[PDB]
Structure formats: structure tokens, C-alpha cells
Design a protein around this ligand. Structure first.
Ligand code: M44
Ligand code: M44
Ligand code: BA
Ligand code: BA
Ligand code: BA
Ligand code: MN
Ligand code: MN
Ligand code: MN
Ligand code: MN
Ligand code: MN
Ligand code: MN
Ligand code: MN
Lengths: 422, 428
């Protein structure tokens, strides 16, 4: 039951609010869910995306014009938008709820003296019209983002659920790929098994076949299946109550050959890497180990004619693994706080020290990218590359294997692999 | 006939329109900004991109931010085409109608624009960006009004594009209707539709309305139930399709068993709808058809004995608006609810109502969407007035579980004939 954990979640957020509003001499904090954005010269709207700082309090992620007023001592106030034009859950009990019928009528529900209420939201003009003066003050943002990195038990439960949903999608997509479906059909299967509409996914799914696996930010879906099937890379997640999953699997169509061997080797490394998560360990250290294991893979597979250490030393591994090893995840897919050393807020996304109750992705990759390979060929590192072998693996695109892992004090919970996603 | 051939005449037409408006407004030229990607608050995700309708009026490029068209109508239009270069990430028929220049980063655009921007109209959303570039004429009304007025007269290219949008949507509607009769859920029916049209959700020109039972009475229903209802009674689906920036906008209503009072109601509305389609004609005000719809809705109410009055009495007492609360339809094209539908002249003067009021002409494209609904709120208001006595509330109660009815086609008006794109593609 989520309701039991949720009670503790509110209590934690109230505690956090109490601390920062005392420290920064405020009366309260006002969290603005957001608004509907209208398309230029049109009467159509973009899909609504809630303020992360709003939904941090409660699973209301599809409602604009909502407001939260909290001071950490009284019950948080919730202004809940609810129009009446002809066109009650467990969390409700924890707020004093006021219903709003028209957004411009919010002004009589907010504090008369807004001088010392920090407005937390996107809409600065609306805030100033209402009478707010302090908007998104850095000390306050920094403080919340720092503590967003420690997930309450409520949040962990939500994140286990989002993972479980995503893992059903990933399996359906995997099966669809082995049946030789198009990227577009694979995506439909993924949406169907997760019961997600496209604007429900926490990010735009990456569903790639063959050469497209090397396109790191690939977003399209081919409606036409490839003449031959070689490789498949799916990076997709899911939402539960505002919390995200973010999972990548890569597959060889045949299960035999050098690329299939490459994939399984990357998988052992990625599991090894996961298991190095531990309290009191700088995340950056794992990112260094990943370049080393990637160096060793390139050497072992005779993609590069050097020892693993020499590949690292000559700066060759960045050509094949050009992004960070991972990141915090939670309410945002690339979650906040991943750079902060303290509450004050003093390439690689996470450098912060690992601790209990933090949640991570571990996503080593190995790609054969056109422009990066062209750069290397121009350097003195030309002599060392096995160009014949790059040509061989090129048609398969690349590889990424990505899990979501919760760190505990004396254990790790790899959510994705504990769900038996191979 | 083929799109490539028709497009040549489309460009020539846009050039001619540009020449007249810049000459009249004393401009040097017009600049269409496709738009930009919008970042989510405190995040590094983006909203889905939506192109400036005035930009895609020129060419079928709808997924590309940071593009600019510089037109004056005499020289070939200059296209500034965004094409970034990084490891993370133009040869079709329309390309050689533009003087094209590639832009590898958005902040490098100042170079490619006119050095003196004083008499160039900026047509776009990003006012402050455009000001910083030096533009000072932001979306000038005389120019907006003028382009939006002529948007009502589709070129042959645009007509062909809209026939393809309609073709694709009709596929979706057939898959959806089949899915309905198999007792599927709203969410599974929407999936069938997206499959048949090969559209991602953000490709549809609007958010699909896929409603079962009482949900059919929620005009702006947007959710997709994951759970099939225990009893299937009714289905209403309002859904379109994009082709090259042009929209289709189709609605069908179905009864599950195809027998009974609600099923006969659908059949009756269908016949009214078809009769209203054939009322489109050059010279007629679209208002004249809107009033006929109300007459016909009043006639349905009278015949089915939902209201105990003659059709004419029902209209006089203003009762039909309880059951048909919206407009008969609207222009359609680049925008779903297309521009120019209220304008009486190029100066943007308002044709007064008795949405769309403008005098109908050849080459314009309309929706026709009569509907009849049983809406709690509106029936509640009806129960408060001195028209209480005239309503059969028992029959209303029996029909309420079916939600409502809408039937919507996209029709082209020709000088001598009408072209119902939707019924031509065999969607009954
Ligand atoms: C959310 C996902 C699609 N992006 P990522 O954080 O897994 N970055 C990858 C491209 C390395
Ligand atoms: C475009 C669609 C979603 N709505 P509509 O203009 O076809 N009809 C109205 C009455 C809902
Ligand atoms: Ba070997
Ligand atoms: Ba070997
Ligand atoms: Ba060593
Ligand atoms: Mn105080
Ligand atoms: Mn005070
Ligand atoms: Mn990912
Ligand atoms: Mn990730
Ligand atoms: Mn001609
Ligand atoms: Mn419609
Ligand atoms: Mn319509």
C-alpha cells in the first residue's frame, strides 16, 4: 500500500520545507503546477508537462493552474483547478484543498501579503501580476534539488512500479523485433504493453534498428522494416505518479557472430559496473572504470590494435563511448542534484558522492559513429585503428545497456534486472 | 496532376500574394519563422515541435525549428534550412523553388537575413528573438489579415494534399470502427487508429476524441480509458490525419447493436448530415446552413418525440441549442480550424453571425458536423426554464447512456460540384 508510505513522504517534505523557509527567512513557498501552452495562431495546445517541484508533493501531473502553499508546519494548502464548462484519493487527506473554477480567480486564494512567499514555477509574469517578488530563488531551488536526490520510501515504491511497467514494454518490443517488425510497429507494441500514450512516456522513446543504433539522439520511427535485420537498440521508460524509468537494451538478431559477442561482453561490463555502486563512492570513479572496460573491449575485439591501458592513455575510447556513464533518476529523467556537493549547490552528469536511498542509471555504450570515427582517422591515432573491423561492425550501429539501480546501505537493488529483463 | 507539377503553381500563387501585400503595405519583403523547440521547466526535455502555420504554407517542412523564409514575390523565396552537425543526430521536388542556405546553429542566422530589416515583416512567435535580430514589424495585422483571408482559397496542390490527409484518416477510422465492434477499450481503439494511419500521437493534427457510451456526450473528451466498459452501447470517434501540414477532421458515431432508438437516431442524423453537405454552394453564407442544421435538429427532436413540439416551435423557444450546442463546422486546411472563416474582406472585416460566417466560394474546404447530444449540464439548465413541460424526460433518460452523436465530413467546394472527400473514400 502506497498510502502508508505516502504519509511519511508528506512528513518528510514538510520537514524539508520547514528547514529551508526558516533558513531563508520566508513565510512560505508557493508551487505552481504550470499552464496549458497554446500553439501560435492556433487554438490547439501542447501537451501539458507539470512543474517537477509541484508533483514532488503529489501525483497530480495532468492538471495546470494548480498551486501548493506550504510552510512546513501547517497542512500544505492545495489549490486544485477544476472547471465546470459542459465540454478523493489517499493523498487528498493531506492537503487543505480549495477548488478553483477559473485560473484568474486564483488571486483570492493566495496569501494577501505575498512579499515573503517564494514563487516556484515557470510563469514569472503570472507570478508578478499576482504580487510575488521572489521567484525561483537559487538558495531554495538548490536546497530542494539537493534533497530530491534522497528518495523517500514512497518515491522508491513509485519508481519500482514505473520500472515494472517499462519492463513489460521492453519485452514486447524485443519480441516484436525478432518477428522482424518496423521501428514504428515495435513502438506501437511498446506503448500497448505499457498502456502508455506517446505523451505518457517520460522521454521520447529511442527505437532503433541497424545503423540507427549509432544515432545517439535518434527520435524517428521507420514505418518500413529493413530488408535485413541485424541489430536493435531500445531506450524507453515509463511513468508512475510522476516518477520515471529509463532503460536501454541492445539485441543481435541472430544471437551468433561478432556483434552478438560484442553485446554480451558489454552486458558483463555493465553488470560489473552496476555492482560497483556503493555508499561513499564518487560516481566519477565508476565513469573512469567504464572507459577502462570499454578500452578492454576494443582491444579484445581487435577493433583497436593496442592494450586497454594504451587505448585509455591515447584518448581513443571517447570515440566509441562518447557520453556519460549515468545519472540520478526520479521525478525528472535526468534528475536534479547530480552535481551538488552540499545544499548550497557548490559530458558526465553525475559527480556527486553516492549514498543510501539514491537511484541511478548505469548505461555504458559502444558505438560506431560516422563523425567521431572521421575525427580519429585525422589524428596520429590512425595507425592504431583496425579500420577493416570498424567497417564490419558499422552496419550494426552501436550498443547501450542501461539499468536503474537503487542504492541501499548494505545492498543494491537493480530494479530492471530483478524484473528479469535480460 | 502529380504533386510535383501542382506545387509549381502553388509557389507561383504564393509569390503573387506576397507581391500584392508587400506593395500595398510598403514593405521590402516578408519573413516566415518556422519556430523553435520549447524546453520543459527546470528540465532538459522538450515539448513536441509545432511549425508556424504561415511557414508551412510555403513547403512541406513541418519538423524543423529555426527555419526562415524570406519572400518578396519576385525573386525566388530564400529558404534558411536548419541542419545541425553533431554525432548525436533537401532534395525533394519543392527544394529547387527556394534559394536554400544551410544553418548549422541558430545564433548564426543574423548573417543570412537582410542587412536592413526595417521594412521586413517578421511573421512568427518569437518576438523578442526577432527584435534582438533587429526586426521591428511584428506580425502586422494588415499582413496577417491578408494572408489569412486568401488561405481560404486552396491551391490545387493544397487540395491534393488534403485528399491524402483524408485518405489516411479514413483508414484509421475503419480500423477504429472494427476495433469498437470487437468490444475493445478506448485505449485499444486509439491504438488501432494510430496503427492504420501510421501516425504517432503527436502527428495527429489534433488530439483524438475516442469516446464510448456516456463519454460520447463530452464534446472535448481527451482521455483514453484503458478498461473496456462492461456494456458497449455507443462509439464516437473524432480523429484526423496530417499530410504535408494539411489536416483531415473526421467524426463518426456508431451504435453497437445497430438496432433500437439510438441507432435510428444515428441513421436520421446521418441523412441530415448528407443533406447539409449538399447545401454547400458558392454564394451562400455558411450561416444559412447553420440555421438549417438547427431546423433539422429540431425536426429530429420532434419526430423522435424527445421534445413535444413542432420543429418550428422548438426553434423559436431556442431549445435546439440544448441538444446541438456548437457550430455546424469550419474551414479546414493547414490549421484544423482554419483561418479566414469569419472575414468578409481582405482587411479582416467581420462577417456577422446569424465560427464560420464567410460567404462560400469555389476551392474552399469545409467540415460539416451536425450533432445531437444528451449533456447533463445543458439538460439541467433546460429543466430550470419554463420549457420544462415540453420535454420527454423519460426518453432523455433512456438515451442519456449513449452520450450523443456527431457525423463530420471534409468537403471541397468546386464551382459546379462538391467533393466530399470523406464519403468518396468509402467511410459510411
Ligand atoms: C532518456 C534517454 C533516451 N536518454 P539517456 O539519458 O539514456 N542518454 C543516452 C542517449 C546516452
Ligand atoms: C477537431 C475536433 C477535435 N473537434 P471538432 O472541430 O471536429 N468538433 C467540435 C464540436 C468538438
Ligand atoms: Ba574472434
Ligand atoms: Ba578476441
Ligand atoms: Ba590497470
Ligand atoms: Mn516565517
Ligand atoms: Mn512574516
Ligand atoms: Mn536511457
Ligand atoms: Mn539514461
Ligand atoms: Mn492554372
Ligand atoms: Mn472533428
Ligand atoms: Mn471539426
Amino acid at each position: 500500500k502506497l498510502a502508508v508510505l505516502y504519509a511519511e513522504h508528506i512528513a518528510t517534505l514538510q520537514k524539508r520545507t520547514r528547514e529551508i523557509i526558516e533558513r531563508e527567512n520566508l513565510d512560505g513557498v508557493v508551487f505552481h503546477s504550470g499552464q496549458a501552452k497554446r500553439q501560435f495562431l492556433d487554438d490547439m495546445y501542447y501537451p501539458f508537462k507539470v512543474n517537477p517541484q509541484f508533483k514532488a508533493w503529489l501525483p497530480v501531473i495532468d492538471n495546470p493552474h494548480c498551486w501548493i502553499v506550504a510552510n512546513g508546519t501547517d497542512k500544505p494548502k492545495l489549490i486544485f483547478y477544476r472547471p465546470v464548462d459542459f465540454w478523493n484519493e489517499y493523498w487528498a487527506d493531506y492537503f487543505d484543498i480549495e477548488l478553483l473554477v477559473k485560473p484568474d480567480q486564483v488571486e483570492k486564494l493566495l496569501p494577501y501579503d505575498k512579499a515573503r512567499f517564494a514563487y516556484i514555477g515557470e510563469y514569472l509574469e503570472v507570478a508578478q501580476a499576482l504580487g510575488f517578488e521572489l521567484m525561483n530563488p537559487e538558495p531554495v531551488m538548490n536546497f530542494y534539488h539537493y534533497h530530491r536526490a534522497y528518495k523517500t520510501q514512497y518515491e522508491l515504491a513509485c519508481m519500482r512500479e514505473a520500472n515494472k511497467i517499462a519492463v513489460q514494454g521492453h519485452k514486447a518490443a524485443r519480441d516484436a523485433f525478432f518477428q522482424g517488425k518496423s521501428e514504428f510497429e515495435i513502438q506501437q507494441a511498446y506503448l500497448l504493453a505499457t498502456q502508455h500514450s506517446e505523451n505518457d512516456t517520460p522521454f521520447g522513446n529511442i527505437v532503433a534498428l541497424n545503423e540507427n543504433c549509432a544515432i545517439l539522439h535518434y527520435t524517428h520511427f521507420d514505418r518500413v522494416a529493413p530488408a535485413t535485420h541485424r541489430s536493435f537498440l531500445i531506450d524507453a521508460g515509463a511513468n508512475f505518479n510522476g516518477y520515471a524509468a529509463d532503460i536501454t537494451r541492445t539485441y543481435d538478431f541472430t544471437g551468433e557472430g561478432e556483434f552478438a559477442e560484442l553485446v554480451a561482453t558489454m552486458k558483463q561490463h555493465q553488470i560489473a559496473l552496476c555492482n560497483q555502486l556503493a555508499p561513499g563512492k564518487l560516481y566519477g570513479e565508476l565513469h573512469l572504470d567504464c572507459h577502462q572496460r570499454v578500452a578492454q573491449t576494443l582491444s579484445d575485439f581487435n577493433i583497436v590494435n593496442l592494450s586497454a591501458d594504451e587505448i585509455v592513455a591515447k584518448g581513443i575510447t571517447s570515440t566509441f563511448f562518447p557520453h556519460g556513464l549515468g545519472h540520478h533518476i526520479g521525478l525528472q529523467v535526468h534528475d536534479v542534484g547530480g552535481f551538488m556537493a552540499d545544499e548550497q549547490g557548490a559530458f558526465l552528469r553525475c559527480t556527486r558522492k553516492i549514498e543510501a536511498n539514491q537511484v541511478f542509471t548505469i548505461e555504458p555504450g559502444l558505438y560506431f559513429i560516422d563523425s567521431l570515427l572521421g575525427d580519429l582517422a585525422a589524428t596520429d591515432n590512425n595507425q592504431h585503428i583496425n579500420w577493416d573491423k570498424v567497417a564490419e561492425l558499422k552496419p550494426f550501429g552501436g550498443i547501450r545497456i542501461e539499468d536503474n539501480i537503487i542504492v541501499h546501505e548494505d545492498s543494491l537493488e537493480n530494479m530492471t534486472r530483478e524484473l528479469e529483463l535480460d
